[PDB]
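Replying to the earlier thread about multi-chain prediction with a worked example.

Input:
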Amino acid sequence: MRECISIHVGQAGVQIGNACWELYCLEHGIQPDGQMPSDKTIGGGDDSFNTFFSETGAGKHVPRAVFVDLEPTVIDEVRTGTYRQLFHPEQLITGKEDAANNYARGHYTIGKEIIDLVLDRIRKLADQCTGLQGFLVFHSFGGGTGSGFTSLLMERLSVDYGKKSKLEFSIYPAPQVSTAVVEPYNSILTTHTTLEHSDCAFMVDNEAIYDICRRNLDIERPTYTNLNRLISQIVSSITASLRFDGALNVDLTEFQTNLVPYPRIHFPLATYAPVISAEKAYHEQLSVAEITNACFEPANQMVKCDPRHGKYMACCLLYRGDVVPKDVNAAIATIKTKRSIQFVDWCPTGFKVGINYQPPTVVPGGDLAKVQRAVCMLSNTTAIAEAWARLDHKFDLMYAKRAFVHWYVGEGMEEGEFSEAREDMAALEKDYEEVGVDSV
Amino acid sequence: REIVHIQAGQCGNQIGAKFWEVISDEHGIDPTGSYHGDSDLQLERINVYYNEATGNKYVPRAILVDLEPGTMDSVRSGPFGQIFRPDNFVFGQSGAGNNWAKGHYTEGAELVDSVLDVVRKESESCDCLQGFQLTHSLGGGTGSGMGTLLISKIREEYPDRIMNTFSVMPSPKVSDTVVEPYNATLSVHQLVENTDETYCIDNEALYDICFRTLKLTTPTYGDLNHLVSATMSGVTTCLRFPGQLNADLRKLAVNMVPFPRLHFFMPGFAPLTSRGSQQYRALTVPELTQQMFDSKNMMAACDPRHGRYLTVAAIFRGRMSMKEVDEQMLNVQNKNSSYFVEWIPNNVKTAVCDIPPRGLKMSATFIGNSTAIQELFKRISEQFTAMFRRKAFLHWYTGEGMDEMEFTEAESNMNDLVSEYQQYQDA
Ligand SMILES: *[C@H]1[C@@H](C)[C@H]2[C@@H]([C@H](O)[C@H]3[C@H]4[C@H]([C@H](OC(C)=O)[C@H](OC(C)=O)[C@@]32C)[C@]2(C)[C@H](C[C@@H]3O[C@@H]3[C@@H]2OC(C)=O)C(=O)[C@@H]4O)[C@]2(C)[C@@]1(O)OC(=O)[C@@]2(C)O
Ligand SMILES: Nc1nc2c(ncn2[C@@H]2O[C@H](COP(=O)(O)OP(=O)(O)OP(=O)(O)O)[C@@H](O)[C@H]2O)c(=O)[nH]1
Ligand SMILES: Nc1nc2c(ncn2[C@@H]2O[C@H](COP(=O)(O)OP(=O)(O)O)[C@@H](O)[C@H]2O)c(=O)[nH]1
Ligand SMILES: [Ca+2]
Ligand SMILES: [Mg+2]
Ligand SMILES: [Mg+2]
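Result:
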């Protein structure tokens, strides 16, 4: 048991979902038709991969997942694509009219028409769990559905499932691939609304991923496909602790204990390595020391910010592949003596380490070199508040003129909701400032 | 004169399993529960830890407890996993998430009555139950939170029996989560009131022994546990084999505990020899004695020279000169008399058992009630305060219904414990 249900919301959530589940299948040896020859227990089981996959009597391994979008064309590609046999038709849910990059339409006008159906389908999955751990919710900040519907769903999930854990993978907007001027509005609105209902949220800065694809993989103009394959590797690293077993494989929930010192301070910074092309990986072994060192290069971060000018409240290292504790300990020792790693005075300075022996996997036709060992660092740093600061400033510029606000008001929202949301974000920035101040 | 063993949580069940492997070997019991030894000295007091079952089998009087099935599944499939009574596996599914509150107040509260039913079944088959021994960590949630809950419940139902614990203290040096100082402080609060004897096993010390002395660059928890189970075998030798000194739990307590709250012992073991050519070297009684008193052989990271011994129990194992043992023990006291409080005359007691442990021709186990143990609690207190100052990570606990006041109270009592040690260190 300890099942995990994934919910993929809007285009970004769905398309990232595609990449994640394809990768999971390849990591576990699950075919596109759902068959898994190595699984000798037919129709069920309590293996580690069962946290993410249920099983049918016919031997099909089915993602514990729901895909939701307010228009049909993205999910329609799942329905007709390579892994269409993987999902039951009822797991893939679509409306006919999207939120038009408007939080109001995602949370209210359009979202309300489909929310009950979505919850019913999620309930169907939950009732098949013997020990449900919680939910993972994938969505953009900037889209109308990703922002508006997600926050509606999170509110309703808190009612129907209480304090059952809810984690987010949230796509933070970047101008290189953004599709709406109002994405700062949608971002602040959903962040405010979801804050009390989320236990932990992994922000993914599209610009950070964009830069990584350009610099480390020599991709001239990254597409969502490029971005999502990288993002999936990082999500896989984080969930691998749940999907594989091993003596040194520390569960994500245990990292969470360290990562969340106060309820609102639940936004870890993810850093991943190695991201390297096949051309450059050839005849190049990246050691434990090398990939570990790369975790403190801000260019490898999932969110653009500078931890060297902030304070740490936690540092977690999630290794996978050919890695043993001896080498990790040596690597960390070196880093302790050379890097800019200052902790707040109220938390221990020790790094928490987990190791999963299953090696990193890559999708065919991908950009990433297949490597023998990889690492994802999860740190709690005051620096991540930079991301809030940038968004909040963009919000302030437009809202001072009430630009585009009539679109939200026309859908029933009030200016009070905007100022309330913005005030919460101001308080959040203040929170990250306060935790960094020394104790009396 | 039966003892009921309880092992709670991951650490508790893993050291617990190791303990039963070790003493089973000593008593000649194989994984099936059959005696295949060649000495009646092995069976003379085997009733203390084992029930005799049909087919002339020996079954540990052991109850295995956890809020998640993982570790106990591994115990079941372990070397001596088959020996345990299957009905004595009591486990939930939810886990405790390294949360004392979950173990003590919510998740554990749901499971504790089931455990007590098994305790009662075992106690009813005892001719004359002397008491209980618990193995657990203080840094987690189940062993710490639910373990101290169990202790409280057991005291309520058996208020005139002895409660003994092997308690693994957390250390940043060997740590799983940052909230370990919270869990430990909350637990010490319980142990000070509800145990008669507590063996303080410091993970910091276990690591330093493995690293410095035993030359292991990268010790696993399994290697830490070899030290613990060896030590546990030593300190319980007097209970398991015929002898005069500290032959039961109450007589040990009367000898070791001059004041009821000061019942936290530093255990020690010798020899601790790194692998190589010197591993085959013959050990003399003088060398054993010196090593057993050496701070580097202590299982609690405290400097004995920073305090005074209130009481000491020493137990030698193997074929050796009783005369030489007596002479060397007297030498220690007479050559270092200032470290033994003069207001407790003759406070060092020595036992000698013929049966040595596996893989050694002779060994010595040390049990000290030293005021230096205050350093251990001071460490936890400082780590506690660093976080509690800012109420860091407290939401994990308040979410289970706990209030800040309960933390304040636990901290104050542990600080009182420290000052009580300092009082007698200066007396
Ligand atoms: C860890 C490894 C360090 C453990 C190993 C054996 O079970 C342990 C043997 C033990 C070794 O002691 C040493 C190296 O000086 C060591 O245990 C330690 C260091 O704690 C071993 C290899 C032996 C050789 C013991 C016989 C004799 O008493 C001497 C020594 O133990 C003591 C008291 O120092 C044994 O023969 C032990 O088998 C493992 C398997 C290890 O690899 O992982 C474990 O769980 C372990 C402790 O069992
Ligand atoms: N990384 C990544 N980002 C995406 C992807 N698709 C969209 N985005 C980002 O998501 C934001 C727009 O939100 P969408 O998910 O497309 O919109 P939606 O959730 O479908 O909401 P509506 O279309 O308005 O109903 C922009 O910042 C995009 O850059 C994707 O596949 N991968
Ligand atoms: N010596 C030793 N300590 C352990 C072991 N497992 C966990 N610990 C320690 O115990 C604490 C964690 O408690 P744990 O027993 O895992 O949690 P629980 O299952 O909820 O009781 C930490 O301080 C760990 O360092 C073990 O096998 N051996
Ligand atoms: Ca199966
Ligand atoms: Mg859309
Ligand atoms: Mg544990």
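The first strand of chain B starts at residue 3 and ends at 8.

Feel free to reuse this layout for your own posts.
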